[PDB]
Subunit: 235 residues, 2 copies
């Protein structure tokens, strides 16, 4: 009968209006949350921020999209039933019609892409910083060792043997100071591996290359001092 139809279509309108408003408020809260995110400059924080965007993509993002489509269906259904009964058309409140709701879906979709893009930028810059944090002192220390490598491999001295030995011992003591500068360089490399970094355009040395260069250079100094002191004992 006619009063049942009117009551049923009124209840559908009441359900549509309440859900459309709730959808709008929910999208508004989620888009504001996205736009409020400030990307970190620390690796594990950015990775969690990126992981947070995946919770939206798997959760409310689908909930919003489904509910917009469900409401667009319901709006069409309401007006379908009204047309069939020669009733006035149903007009949703301003900003709550299905097309407005569709536009809010596009709004948060834009905000979602924009958030993801700035998080990806912050992640690449974080990785570039981690690379440079290893490269700069690694390049410094490698060049410093190589200076001492050049000295100990020079065969050109015509100085008396005792002066050669004193000079070699003094340079070795200098080089040995480098040993204390290595632990922080290893730490920087480990931080790179913690971020799963697998290339470093900024250096051509690994920490093991550096540690090994130091140890071998020190040993060459030691062995040269020994054999020159053997020469001095033979006189």
């Amino acid at each position: 009968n006619f009063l049942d139809f009117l009551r049923a279509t009124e209840g559908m309108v009441h359900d549509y209006e309440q859900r459309a408003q709730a959808l709008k408020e929910n999208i508004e809260a989620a888009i504001n949350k996205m736009n409020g995110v400030e990307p970190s400059d620390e690796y594990h924080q950015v990775k969690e921020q990126i992981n947070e965007t995946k919770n939206y993509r798997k959760g409310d993002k689908r909930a919003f999209i489904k509910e917009q489509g469900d409401l667009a269906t319901l709006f069409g259904q309401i007006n379908s039933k009204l047309r069939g009964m020669k009733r006035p058309v149903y007009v949703a409140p301003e900003g709550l019609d299905p097309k407005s709701l569709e536009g809010y879906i596009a709004n948060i979709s834009e905000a979602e892409r924009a958030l993801r893009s700035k998080l990806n930028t912050a992640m690449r810059n974080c990785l570039i910083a981690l690379r440079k944090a290893f490269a700069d002192p690694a390049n410094a220390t490698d060049a410093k060792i190589n200076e001492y490598r050049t000295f100990v491999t020079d065969e050109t001295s015509e100085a008396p043997l005792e002066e050669q030995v004193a000079t070699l011992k003094a340079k070795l003591e200098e080089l040995k100071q480098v040993e204390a500068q290595l632990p922080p360089i290893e730490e920087a490399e480990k931080a790179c591996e913690d971020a799963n970094i697998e290339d470093n355009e900024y250096t051509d040395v690994s920490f093991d290359d550096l540690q090994f260069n130091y140890e071998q250079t020190v040993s060459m100094f030691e062995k040269k001092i020994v054999y020159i002191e053997a020469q001095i004992n033979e006189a």
Copy 2:
């Protein structure tokens, strides 16, 4: 006496062997052609890292050992008031140091070669997903636009048929989805975590298809309901 004879023969044999080993390793590196497939390029990069901790260390250690040995020989000869030992051409410690310099440069050049192949590889993997994903997303959205348009002045039986005809067209899309999921899995195998070239994941696309189909089905049902009323 014979100590120096034996060290010289040992030096010259080892200096020559180091020269030839570095030379062969350089040729090998210079001859690597970067692959275009992710797993191959990954394994090419793997081998440079194994050179880095294998023969690279062995060549560097041996160059330094031979510099030391050349030093020991001449220290012994000077103590004995004898003339200095001069290595054969190309085998002196400075030449060996230059061969270390040479292979270091070949290592560097190859490593960047492989790093760009890997970058372009991950780009191609991203595009292999993005291009069909973007195309299918637009296609689904075309049918989403159709079913959410309520401008039809036609008999209900005719709207139902048109909606069923459009739905059947839309269901042709489902067969396009499995190749797109495999393109995503291929990205996940290369540990790709970002895609600048698309705004849609595979689950986004699947969901859009599932919801758009369902909106057609529900619109069919409530117009069919109006037909018998």
